[PDB]
Amino acid sequence: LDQSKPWNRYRLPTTLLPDSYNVTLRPYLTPNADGLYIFKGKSIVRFICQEPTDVIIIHSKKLNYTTHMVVLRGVGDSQVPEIDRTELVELTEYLVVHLKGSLQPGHMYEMESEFQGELADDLAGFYRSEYMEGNVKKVLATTQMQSTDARKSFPCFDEPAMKATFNITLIHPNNLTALSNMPPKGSSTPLAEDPNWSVTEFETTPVMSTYLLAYIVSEFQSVNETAQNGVLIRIWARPNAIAEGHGMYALNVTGPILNFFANHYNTSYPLPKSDQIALPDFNAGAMENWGLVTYRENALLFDPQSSSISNKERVVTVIAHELAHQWFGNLVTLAWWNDLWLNEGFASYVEYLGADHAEPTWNLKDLIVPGDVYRVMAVDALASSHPLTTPAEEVNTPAQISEMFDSISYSKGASVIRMLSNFLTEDLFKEGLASYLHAFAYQNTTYLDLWEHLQKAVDAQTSIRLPDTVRAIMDRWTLQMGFPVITVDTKTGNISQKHFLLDSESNVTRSSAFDYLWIVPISSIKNGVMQDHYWLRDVSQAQNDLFKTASDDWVLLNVNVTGYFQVNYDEDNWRMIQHQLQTNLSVIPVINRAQVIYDSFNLATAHMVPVTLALDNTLFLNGEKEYMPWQAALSSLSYFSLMFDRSEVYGPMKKYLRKQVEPLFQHFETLTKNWTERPENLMDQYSEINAISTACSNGLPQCENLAKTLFDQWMSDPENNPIHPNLRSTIYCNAIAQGGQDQWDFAWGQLQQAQLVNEADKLRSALACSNEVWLLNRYLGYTLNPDLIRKQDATSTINSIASNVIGQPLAWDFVQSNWKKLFQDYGSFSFSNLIQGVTRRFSSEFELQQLEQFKKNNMDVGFGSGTRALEQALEKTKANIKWVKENKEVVLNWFIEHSLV
Amino acid sequence: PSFLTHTIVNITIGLGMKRSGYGQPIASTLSNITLPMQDNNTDVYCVRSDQFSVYVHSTCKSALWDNVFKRNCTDVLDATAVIKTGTCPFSFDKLYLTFNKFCLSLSPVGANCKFDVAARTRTNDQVVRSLYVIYEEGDSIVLVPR
Ligand SMILES: *[C@@H]1O[C@H](CO)[C@@H](O[C@@H]2O[C@H](CO)[C@@H](O)[C@H](O)[C@H]2NC(C)=O)[C@H](O)[C@H]1NC(C)=O
Ligand SMILES: *[C@@H]1O[C@H](CO)[C@@H](O[C@@H]2O[C@H](CO)[C@@H](O)[C@H](O)[C@H]2NC(C)=O)[C@H](O)[C@H]1NC(C)=O
Ligand SMILES: *[C@@H]1O[C@H](CO)[C@@H](O)[C@H](O)[C@H]1NC(C)=O
Ligand SMILES: *[C@@H]1O[C@H](CO)[C@@H](O)[C@H](O)[C@H]1NC(C)=O
Ligand SMILES: *[C@@H]1O[C@H](CO)[C@@H](O)[C@H](O)[C@H]1NC(C)=O
Ligand SMILES: *[C@@H]1O[C@H](CO)[C@@H](O)[C@H](O)[C@H]1NC(C)=O
Ligand SMILES: *[C@@H]1O[C@H](CO)[C@@H](O)[C@H](O)[C@H]1NC(C)=O
Ligand SMILES: *[C@@H]1O[C@H](CO)[C@@H](O)[C@H](O)[C@H]1NC(C)=O
Ligand SMILES: *[C@@H]1O[C@H](CO)[C@@H](O)[C@H](O)[C@H]1NC(C)=O
Ligand SMILES: *[C@@H]1O[C@H](CO)[C@@H](O)[C@H](O)[C@H]1NC(C)=O
Ligand SMILES: *[C@@H]1O[C@H](CO)[C@@H](O)[C@H](O)[C@H]1NC(C)=O
Ligand SMILES: [Zn+2]
């Protein structure tokens, strides 16, 4: 476009600011002419001038009006100029008002407009969601103005900065229930005409920023409690879901969490009530609409009679994240989307904090490490990565805004902020946190404003101390991509710091102020005793006698991995840590037992340590009973169990893993009374899950026994499942592998009968585990029949069959045989998630030839939707081919040696 | 002939059992055990008469991983409640104790010793819950077996 006029640039001018909106809108939940759903509305926006101009610019998206176009009235006092034309720019979604005359500061003006738009099902703006209950198509009206999409509901100033107050009303079908940010003003009143309609008026909101707006007309009901402070808490779900305490858990914990955050913020909950609604389809996990927070059902509801413990954690930690935003994000909103990282990153950290308060006994807090820290480290360790802080001038198009939702501006964000709260000693962090809130309540902020208030707090205190200023320390982490690998020569005491990529040979090009150096907070432990503390300055090398050892003595850095960095040691300290882990492993904290495994493997990948070394860091597992260290070993090990699983090394490797697990399997067998009562501690349950899964997939007799015996019991009496949801995934995916068509055909029966998505998903995957070639090929056939398997779950199923070592060539041939038919018909299909997961194993020059061919063969009919998924699959193979030719002999010999008894 | 007051402490144990992963009958610790109602409501009973007899009323139900117990113990699952000699220097098993105070409690709180209520399966005795007893020894209140 040709920008020179304030309606060809993507940002709203600073000329006029909104004071308050009067917004009435009416959803038609029954198809219209041509079978079209519509909503009608009428807004009275009241802006204020800040600098004179002859033009008015509000946001407006996909909305028809009344063929003037808007009425302008001056609040009594005001002099109202007249309206020339009244254009509509469909690119920079503006409703442009051209004026004959001008308008000046101080005087507020009111703009009236009535309109209507498509109440489509795009899960965006004001939209409809159709859901099947019984066998009826029900339809409700919900909102999802996230980033933009408020314009898609009514003309307004849709930027997160321009906060305003909102008077909301919903004209709706007489017997449905109207919901919004604030409680209903009074009771719902019969509409003048069409007395089959009611009118529900809502109390005026605080000063929010659109995009936190929510209105819902539905057939829903609720469960509710009232916390000892007057605030009303309500869990909204479908009437049936409410019948059985499906929403009970999500109410049980909503209160406690709501308290925690009140205290942790030294701020009272800023609204009269807190509604959390469970929508059946709702894509984006959840939405923190102020007062009325939307969740996908699997995320908010919990069935104790058909859900795993895994499902419980998901509920607590997502209510936590979303209720967290109720202060930090909505009460004090970040200025622009460029600083989104702070908002989401923060809530991504306090998730666990709030969660932990609800389930004190679970030890969530820890989970941040593997679920967030190491997770994001995998993507922040390539040249492809980027830094959290991106300049505002570089974020404009609604597209650019959306790309602000990386895993970095979420997990990195959380890690970074977690480490911050850690080197300022919590208490202090909360003080700055609070002064920040009170200071900017009901107004915009940048991330620098929080950095300041944390200084204001460290400055006012003499107890703890940092090297440089808070902002100085943070900038090392927020302004440049990646993280360092801290290296320690325990013989001397020397210390290194270096930008850590795992691709030893890389064209890192993103130029960096600071030269990729960090100010690193380094806790440490020497022989279980906690050392003092150190800070790596933005310098390459250093030294301290904290990191020096005797003959028999080990150091170990980054306790509880509260430091966004990876530690490497000299080849002797490792060996000392290994020996410690072998004997009394209780000495090293459990999160570090994880760390040592996570780190050594990533190091081995980067060629900083021998592949064999990371391997020795798993020998201590025969005495390990806790989820996190084991989970670490598996994650990092499963790439091995995929390169070598059709090879000469799978033999000993499979043997080795059986050796390491048996004692753990034994422990749980006993602790759990022959698998009749699951452990209590969430993380202990998580361990039993992996305990079994590993024992079975590696051929441990009693495990295979257990799985069979249980499944037999199930077919011996279906409709009464004896297998605990925790174990179903593993038991199924083994019983079936351990048997013939009797079981497969049975599972297939249960699958088609199943109406709960959890089970369906467990079965569907289990079915792919049969070692019967013909059964797999038959299953591959079913895969393309929407009558039996859902096209959405088709790609999932196919390469879930390719996961099976026997099904590998089956799926490969299938995929590359049925390619035409596919595209030519089924061509959203996720054509790329398929080809990746199928060629996922290719690691031989020959397999590359085949892949190279498939490209050439199906070339005249390209791939699109993925192509870079095919080309990139061709990439991952090269890597694999190389990694194997190098690592094979060593890995083989290692697994061979450490399997003997 | 002086009139004595005899109480029959009808303590009823509602066993709960479930088929193990290996198909064994293992007794769940979730089995209910209720005492005769007194002034309060259960959780504690104190013998307040001249003498007393202890009678154990055992039921039995089974459940799957859902810990909901409806169908009754068919078998290898069938079992009945027995009050094993726990950590007390005496037992009910026929063989005339005498106390100055005798109280049965579900709470371990305020307790001397405890009895082990167990499920007597076929070839197995599995402890399920504990029966706490508060006793002060004397010669005023007798205990008649059977
Ligand atoms: C590192 O994290 C561990 C958890 O993995 C912490 O251990 C807990 O510490 C809390 C206090 O922070 C205690 O209340 C708990 O009893 C501990 N939990 C368990 C399960 O042991 C530990 O505090 C942290 N260690 C250091 C040195 O910071
Ligand atoms: C212990 O007693 C309780 C009843 O007080 C049983 O739990 C209830 O059992 C009925 C069916 O018998 C269910 O419909 C209720 O929903 C249960 N309520 C609760 C609190 O769970 C329980 O089955 C008994 N246990 C045994 C082994 O008999
Ligand atoms: C919204 O309602 C409040 C009264 O609760 C009023 O003060 C405010 O001016 C109203 N806004 C508009 C645009 O009329
Ligand atoms: C907005 O609505 C309120 C009541 O909700 C009403 O009193 C007021 O007149 C309205 N403001 C305008 C500008 O119409
Ligand atoms: C808006 O106007 C368009 C003409 O461009 C018309 O086709 C459409 O039906 C209208 N949309 C709605 C939701 O009324
Ligand atoms: C945003 O907050 C600032 C204070 O940082 C305040 O002065 C300003 O008026 C606000 N701007 C808007 C557009 O609301
Ligand atoms: C509620 O009311 C509408 C008409 O106002 C009706 O069509 C609908 O069937 C009613 N819903 C129920 C559950 O009765
Ligand atoms: C929630 O707590 C109540 C008692 O406060 C308890 O009875 C109920 O079982 C709990 N709900 C769930 C789903 O665990
Ligand atoms: C915040 O908590 C402090 C105690 O830490 C208390 O003194 C203060 O009154 C609280 N502020 C509010 C608004 O409740
Ligand atoms: C092992 O070490 C832990 C502390 O690390 C200690 O509590 C425990 O007593 C030790 N056990 C043995 C057998 O030495
Ligand atoms: C649990 O299983 C083991 C192995 O089958 C067996 O030896 C043991 O007796 C079982 N425990 C029971 C029946 O309580
Ligand atoms: Zn969020």
Author numbering:
A (entry chain A): 61 to 127, 130 to 889, 892 to 965
B (entry chain E): 283 to 377, 380 to 430
Original authors' sentences:
Crystals were obtained only with a mixture of a PRCV S protein (S3H) and the pAPN. The asymmetric unit of the crystals contained two macromolecular RBD-pAPN complexes. Each pAPN molecule was engaged by the tip of a single PRCV RBD molecule, which bears two exposed aromatic residues (Tyr and Trp) (in red), and they bound to a membrane-distal region of the pAPN ectodomain. The pAPN crystallized in complex with the PRCV RBD had an open conformation, in which domain IV was ∼20–25 Å from domains I and II; this creates a central cavity in which the zinc ion at the catalytic site is highly accessible. The virus-receptor interaction buried ∼870 Å2 of the virus protein, 60% of which corresponded to the β1–β2 region and 30% to the β3–β4 turn. The Tyr side chain (Tyr528 in TGEV), which protrudes at the β-turn in PRCV and TGEV RBDs, is almost fully buried in the complex, locating between the first N-acetyl glucosamine (NAG7361) linked to pAPN Asn736, the end of helix α19, and the first half of helix α21. The hydroxyl group of the RBD Tyr528 was hydrogen bonded to side chains of pAPN residues Glu731 and Trp737, and contributed to virus-receptor binding specificity.
The cell surface aminopeptidase N (APN), a membranebound metalloprotease target for cancer therapy, is a major cell entry receptor for coronaviruses (CoVs), agents that cause important respiratory and enteric diseases. In some CoVs, the virus envelope spike glycoprotein (S) mediates attachment of the virus particles to the host APN protein and cell entry, which is blocked by antibodies that prevent CoV infections. We determined crystal structures of the PRCV RBD in complex with the pAPN ectodomain, and the TGEV RBD in complex with the neutralizing monoclonal antibody (mAb) 1AF10. The RBD adopts a β-barrel fold, with a distinct protruding tip engaged in pAPN recognition.
